[PDB]
Tab-separated table of C-alpha atoms in Angstrom:
chain	number	residue	atom	x	y	z
A	1	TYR	CA	42.562	-24.229	10.518
A	2	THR	CA	40.151	-21.684	10.021
A	3	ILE	CA	37.423	-20.813	12.333
A	4	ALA	CA	34.735	-17.504	12.311
A	5	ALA	CA	31.771	-17.340	15.015
A	6	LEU	CA	29.885	-13.662	16.093
A	7	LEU	CA	27.415	-14.498	18.963
A	8	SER	CA	26.284	-10.795	20.528
A	9	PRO	CA	23.173	-12.820	23.107
A	10	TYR	CA	21.392	-9.613	25.066
A	11	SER	CA	19.912	-10.596	28.209
B	1	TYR	CA	18.119	-4.212	18.643
B	2	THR	CA	20.416	-3.226	15.770
B	3	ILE	CA	23.532	-6.024	14.479
B	4	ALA	CA	25.769	-6.723	11.152
B	5	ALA	CA	28.873	-8.654	10.719
B	6	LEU	CA	30.165	-9.804	8.023
B	7	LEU	CA	33.353	-13.230	7.831
B	8	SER	CA	35.265	-14.553	5.558
B	9	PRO	CA	37.578	-17.265	6.377
B	10	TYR	CA	39.590	-18.960	4.573
B	11	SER	CA	41.857	-22.646	4.791
C	1	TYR	CA	15.809	-6.281	28.702
C	2	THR	CA	12.466	-3.572	27.918
C	3	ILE	CA	9.905	-2.193	30.045
C	4	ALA	CA	7.587	1.026	29.743
C	5	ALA	CA	4.271	1.088	32.756
C	6	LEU	CA	2.643	4.622	34.165
C	7	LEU	CA	0.246	4.456	37.422
C	8	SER	CA	-1.164	7.011	38.265
C	9	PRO	CA	-4.131	5.803	40.859
C	10	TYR	CA	-5.926	8.864	43.530
C	11	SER	CA	-7.755	8.292	45.662
D	1	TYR	CA	-9.317	13.959	37.047
D	2	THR	CA	-6.922	14.710	33.618
D	3	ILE	CA	-3.761	11.906	32.615
D	4	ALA	CA	-2.055	11.892	29.554
D	5	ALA	CA	0.979	9.253	28.930
D	6	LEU	CA	3.113	7.976	26.016
D	7	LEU	CA	5.984	5.214	26.011
D	8	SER	CA	7.555	3.792	23.438
D	9	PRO	CA	9.999	0.959	24.154
D	10	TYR	CA	12.049	-0.405	22.250
D	11	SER	CA	13.857	-3.724	22.799
E	1	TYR	CA	-12.287	12.428	46.944
E	2	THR	CA	-14.759	14.920	45.446
E	3	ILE	CA	-17.272	15.936	48.201
E	4	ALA	CA	-19.790	19.269	47.842
E	5	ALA	CA	-22.792	19.638	50.383
E	6	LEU	CA	-25.643	22.962	51.686
E	7	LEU	CA	-26.810	22.754	54.755
E	8	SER	CA	-29.271	25.353	56.675
E	9	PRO	CA	-30.751	24.480	59.495
E	10	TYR	CA	-33.317	26.269	60.821
E	11	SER	CA	-35.781	27.182	64.235
F	1	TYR	CA	-37.214	32.216	54.326
F	2	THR	CA	-35.393	32.274	50.496
F	3	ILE	CA	-31.604	30.101	49.751
F	4	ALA	CA	-29.541	29.976	46.997
F	5	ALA	CA	-26.976	27.838	46.683
F	6	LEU	CA	-25.256	26.281	43.911
F	7	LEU	CA	-22.051	23.711	44.003
F	8	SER	CA	-19.975	22.354	40.637
F	9	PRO	CA	-18.106	19.471	42.610
F	10	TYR	CA	-16.091	17.248	40.119
F	11	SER	CA	-13.314	14.799	40.399
G	1	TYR	CA	70.391	-42.730	-7.952
G	2	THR	CA	67.641	-39.504	-8.165
G	3	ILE	CA	65.164	-38.913	-5.803
G	4	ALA	CA	62.330	-35.667	-5.590
G	5	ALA	CA	59.639	-34.745	-3.483
G	6	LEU	CA	57.796	-32.808	-1.630
G	7	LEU	CA	55.089	-32.050	1.280
G	8	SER	CA	53.411	-29.464	2.207
G	9	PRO	CA	51.022	-30.751	5.068
G	10	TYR	CA	48.248	-28.732	7.168
G	11	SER	CA	46.418	-29.003	9.914
H	1	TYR	CA	46.149	-22.800	0.695
H	2	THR	CA	48.726	-22.316	-2.269
H	3	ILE	CA	51.231	-24.157	-3.735
H	4	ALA	CA	53.233	-25.398	-6.603
H	5	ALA	CA	56.720	-27.020	-7.232
H	6	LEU	CA	58.165	-28.605	-10.066
H	7	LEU	CA	61.189	-30.872	-9.865
H	8	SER	CA	62.459	-32.355	-12.586
H	9	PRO	CA	64.976	-35.584	-11.203
H	10	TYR	CA	66.685	-37.492	-14.344
H	11	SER	CA	69.137	-40.294	-13.566
I	1	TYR	CA	-33.418	17.700	71.022
I	2	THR	CA	-31.529	14.037	72.027
I	3	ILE	CA	-28.686	12.490	68.794
I	4	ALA	CA	-26.477	9.859	69.424
I	5	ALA	CA	-24.486	8.932	66.597
I	6	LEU	CA	-21.083	7.469	65.873
I	7	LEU	CA	-19.371	6.585	62.800
I	8	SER	CA	-15.565	4.146	62.685
I	9	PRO	CA	-14.878	5.130	58.297
I	10	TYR	CA	-11.488	3.437	57.604
I	11	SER	CA	-9.821	3.405	53.796
J	1	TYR	CA	-10.976	-4.287	62.214
J	2	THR	CA	-12.791	-4.628	65.399
J	3	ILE	CA	-14.918	-2.242	67.088
J	4	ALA	CA	-17.986	-1.864	70.054
J	5	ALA	CA	-20.416	1.084	70.927
J	6	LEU	CA	-23.330	1.658	73.128
J	7	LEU	CA	-25.504	4.647	72.791
J	8	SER	CA	-28.733	4.738	74.805
J	9	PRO	CA	-29.899	8.514	74.147
J	10	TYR	CA	-32.915	9.592	75.996
J	11	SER	CA	-34.929	12.760	75.048
K	1	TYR	CA	16.386	-23.957	44.553
K	2	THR	CA	14.340	-23.431	47.859
K	3	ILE	CA	11.709	-20.792	49.341
K	4	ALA	CA	9.492	-20.840	52.159
K	5	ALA	CA	7.826	-17.880	53.452
K	6	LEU	CA	4.483	-17.389	55.076
K	7	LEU	CA	2.710	-13.988	55.325
K	8	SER	CA	-1.305	-13.535	57.109
K	9	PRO	CA	-2.065	-9.873	56.107
K	10	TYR	CA	-5.040	-8.714	58.211
K	11	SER	CA	-7.598	-5.788	57.274
L	1	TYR	CA	-5.537	-1.076	53.517
L	2	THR	CA	-3.758	-4.256	53.614
L	3	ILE	CA	-1.957	-6.176	51.217
L	4	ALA	CA	1.259	-8.722	51.554
L	5	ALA	CA	3.371	-10.211	48.498
L	6	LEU	CA	6.496	-11.724	48.013
L	7	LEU	CA	8.804	-12.624	44.797
L	8	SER	CA	11.886	-13.999	45.194
L	9	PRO	CA	13.135	-14.076	41.010
L	10	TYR	CA	16.091	-15.149	40.015
L	11	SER	CA	18.167	-15.397	36.601
M	1	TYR	CA	43.743	-42.562	27.344
M	2	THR	CA	42.255	-42.570	30.400
M	3	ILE	CA	39.629	-40.258	31.816
M	4	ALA	CA	36.914	-39.530	34.721
M	5	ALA	CA	35.144	-36.493	35.506
M	6	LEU	CA	31.786	-36.103	37.307
M	7	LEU	CA	29.310	-32.484	38.097
M	8	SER	CA	25.781	-32.409	39.166
M	9	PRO	CA	25.300	-28.545	38.485
M	10	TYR	CA	21.642	-28.021	40.390
M	11	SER	CA	19.940	-24.304	40.108
N	1	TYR	CA	21.796	-20.364	35.960
N	2	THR	CA	23.610	-23.688	36.579
N	3	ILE	CA	26.124	-24.143	34.085
N	4	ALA	CA	28.958	-27.043	33.782
N	5	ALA	CA	31.042	-28.323	31.462
N	6	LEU	CA	34.047	-30.576	30.572
N	7	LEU	CA	36.326	-30.746	27.547
N	8	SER	CA	40.252	-32.613	27.634
N	9	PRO	CA	40.341	-32.529	23.563
N	10	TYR	CA	44.180	-33.513	22.799
N	11	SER	CA	46.272	-34.371	19.539
O	1	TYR	CA	70.963	-60.975	9.886
O	2	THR	CA	69.599	-61.682	12.595
O	3	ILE	CA	67.086	-58.784	14.321
O	4	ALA	CA	64.112	-59.017	16.712
O	5	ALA	CA	62.286	-55.669	17.755
O	6	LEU	CA	58.801	-55.193	19.919
O	7	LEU	CA	56.876	-51.321	19.484
O	8	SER	CA	53.855	-51.053	21.771
O	9	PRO	CA	52.743	-47.785	21.161
O	10	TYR	CA	49.678	-46.920	23.028
O	11	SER	CA	47.265	-43.378	22.235
P	1	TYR	CA	49.822	-38.036	18.845
P	2	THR	CA	51.582	-41.536	18.840
P	3	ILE	CA	53.964	-43.506	16.557
P	4	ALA	CA	56.551	-46.283	16.774
P	5	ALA	CA	58.649	-47.535	13.903
P	6	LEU	CA	61.624	-49.227	13.873
P	7	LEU	CA	64.152	-49.219	9.925
P	8	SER	CA	67.295	-51.581	9.884
P	9	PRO	CA	68.221	-51.283	6.185
P	10	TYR	CA	71.536	-52.723	5.260
P	11	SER	CA	73.896	-52.573	1.947
């Protein structure tokens, strides 16, 4: 499989 | 805020 | 978060 | 009275 | 506060 | 009588 | 007999 | 993906 | 002369 | 607040 | 959540 | 002066 | 398959 | 915060 | 010939 | 996964 995810959650 | 991201996932 | 407050109370 | 204040808060 | 008073009572 | 007084109170 | 088969199964 | 295969089976 | 005064100023 | 005062000034 | 507070401020 | 304040901020 | 799960998350 | 999650992924 | 086989595969 | 197979090939 192939997966690429980016998450930069700030408060 | 400042965010820069690149993702080229291939199978 | 981001906060900026100024208070100069005089009697 | 005399007061001078500057605030540039960025997120 | 700010107060200024003058009194010169004579008899 | 003679009286002379000046008062300039600022806040 | 003669047989030729190729299989490259990926997940 | 990338696959290259050749098969020439003769009887 | 006769004088009587009471003052209880609170902040 | 609570205040109680009595004054009977005579001449 | 659970909160219980009582305040009786008098002047 | 008289002041009473309660604050229970949760995340 | 067989799965059994219970979750009671409170704030 | 409050979070509850269950995941039982099988192949 | 004689053959007898039973298979009950469950997931 | 779940797999069940039987093969009795005779000549």
